[PDB]
Design a protein around this ligand. Structure first.
Ligand SMILES: [Zn+2]
Ligand SMILES: [Zn+2]
Lengths: 77, 79
């Protein structure tokens, strides 16, 4: 389990656990590497955040008798 | 033509909402250049802003107090 080499700088990247997600940041250029399982944790929470926003808007529209077209951020991934 | 820090193989380029993400086709990890990470954070902020302004309007018309949730940027400030 050694450090990972930035693909730009060829220097060893810093690994930090933030909000429960392991991210690797190049100290020289600041690019970021996410292993697939860590990307998945980030996107699962983002999906929750978006769901709550859209359900809250869904209720306001439903009271008005207007349909709410679902948008977004998850659409990026 | 950037090498995966795991697999030492060429990563593929994927463009989403103007953000360029490098994806290893073997292990599936992702690389964001600092400039692309900046663009991702700006897009999350715009998506969040659109939700919060619509909700701010609904609460104002119902006369109920509202404080912004800032749900995306609370997650993405990890960068
Ligand atoms: Zn670097
Ligand atoms: Zn890989």
């Amino acid at each position: 389990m050694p450090l990972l080499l930035c693909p730009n700088c060829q220097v060893g990247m810093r690994e930090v656990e933030r909000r429960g997600v392991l991210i690797d940041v190049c100290p020289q250029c600041g690019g970021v590497w996410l292993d697939k399982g860590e990307l998945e944790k980030l996107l699962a929470e983002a999906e929750e955040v978006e769901r709550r926003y859209e359900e809250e808007l869904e209720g306001f529209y439903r009271k008005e008798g207007k349909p709410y077209k679902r948008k977004g951020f998850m659409k990026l991934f």
